[PDB]
């Protein structure tokens, strides 16, 4: 089959600036009839994909002229002149030269904003969960930017790697920040054998990590 | 207006069969070729099948050929995808896509809302809901963050609201992950520290697949 290759993420850009999303094909999509059978779709968060560009350069009905398509036989570019907040989402290229029809992996476009440190909150396991034999220690790292962040867990000061699950949100549609939850799951016995629990957030906004702790007394 | 509405998704066992339907309205359905395109959870688009206008041409992706059958009822304006011998990898949201082919036409110009197919022998399991309240020795800032941990449920279909929706601006919903074959998510809410515990903050967790709703009132430590 024809392989379509896209970059995974696009460098975040502020609303009103220009952005170019690139796609390439393992075989030329320029047909002998003069058409290049390349399609561009946008999938906004929680929405179905919608057509933006058909046959490389033609604009789909209802699509703003800030979108434009160009390219050659094996390389194609979708250009947005002035980014509008509603343009955030994943951009998929697709070839229609041959069946099976094949897509790029998608280029996720998100908004740039000023850096912001995370608000870190730590929560011990609830008594309710401890009655079930488990113990989840939770650490919320809320409203930070950029998305790259690192969390380290310490139990009685000693670092703990196994049993940690991290979940990032997508970019917040209101303030453009990111948030993430880090959950350390222990048995109840293991949790009650120790006293101090700590999550340390390392973000580019500071050299020293933001440290949150509790002692089970 | 143009409308494509898919249905027939749900939880199916590996090896089972399921027929997806796409009801079309607002355009000359018989004049259009139709595609099925699917999207596995947190992955990209994958083309599944094509049936031309008039049903004279049918193409299938290599992953589904011999197992899936595409068909159309033009009088009833319905597209069908019959799936058999379902595999875990068939788990996806399925989109119906219209596509008319003539000189200067714009193929692929309308996609449906999608229907979700989950192929798994995992059992429907309601969630355990655990409150996340600040510890005993926590320092009180101007604002306080609370949470609810929603653990051990299946399938992945939970809604967490705070004070029946009255708290929404400062809520974070964290995406569910798989843990020991079940799903875990959490939700956080941030309120002024003068409002909690002074006034009640409750998280409501709805899991329609298990017909379960759990309300947890957050208590101070």
Residue numbers in the entry:
A (entry chain A): 21 to 237
B (entry chain B): 20 to 240
What does the report in the manuscript say about this coordinate set?
Rhodopsin has been shown to interact with the Gβγ subunit of the G protein heterotrimer to assist binding and activation of the Gα subunit. Nanobodies, Fab fragments, and mini-G proteins have been very important tools to overcome the inherent instability and flexibility of these complexes and obtain near atomic-resolution structures.
The construct of the human Gαi1 subunit was expressed in E. coli, while the Gβ1γ1 subunit was isolated from bovine retinae and thus contains native post-translational modification important for transducin function.
